[PDB]
């Protein structure tokens, strides 16, 4: 039996909602899925739905509500408690940052710093639970900052190849 543990960003939902729904309905006793939805994702999908009139972002938020309300077979979903961001230390993110990396992590906008806090919390800190986590994203800036902080990431196509 295997379990995949994913942290899913907003761009993954906006660009790959149809793919994610298929993973959720095709998972079996042999392959179970375990999702963590950070505060970044909820806030960014709300921004996309309101400010960009994104149909896919609006549908993604409704799908996340369905996931959190209903108990799907072989699927676990956890929505981040926003107060966790005030407990996670920025110094714990900096301890995983490659200092030779070209991105100035300390100068990123607050919403991206908090996405990094959520990822580090799962990959390395109290949110780990003895599991191996991957970040799913369709945003190059996010994948590049995640790689500099040793957070493994995958595109929608990467996951589709691992699950097929």
UniProtKB/Swiss-Prot annotation:
Keyword Transcription on entry: no
Protein source organism: Saccharomyces cerevisiae (strain ATCC 204508 / S288c)
Superkingdom of this protein's organism: Eukaryota
Function text: Involved in nonsense-mediated decay of mRNAs containing premature stop codons.
GO biological process terms, semicolon-separated: nuclear-transcribed mRNA catabolic process, nonsense-mediated decay
Cellular component annotations (GO), alphabetically ordered: cytoplasm; nucleus
Lineage of the species this protein comes from: Eukaryota, Fungi, Dikarya, Ascomycota, Saccharomycotina
Record gene name: NMD4
Note: Present with 6090 molecules/cell in log phase SD medium.
Main location (coarse class): cytoplasm
TM stretches of this protein: none
Compartments it resides in: Cytoplasm
Keyword line: Cytoplasm, Nonsense-mediated mRNA decay
Included stretch of the parent chain: 2 to 164 of 218
This protein's name: Nonsense-mediated decay protein 4
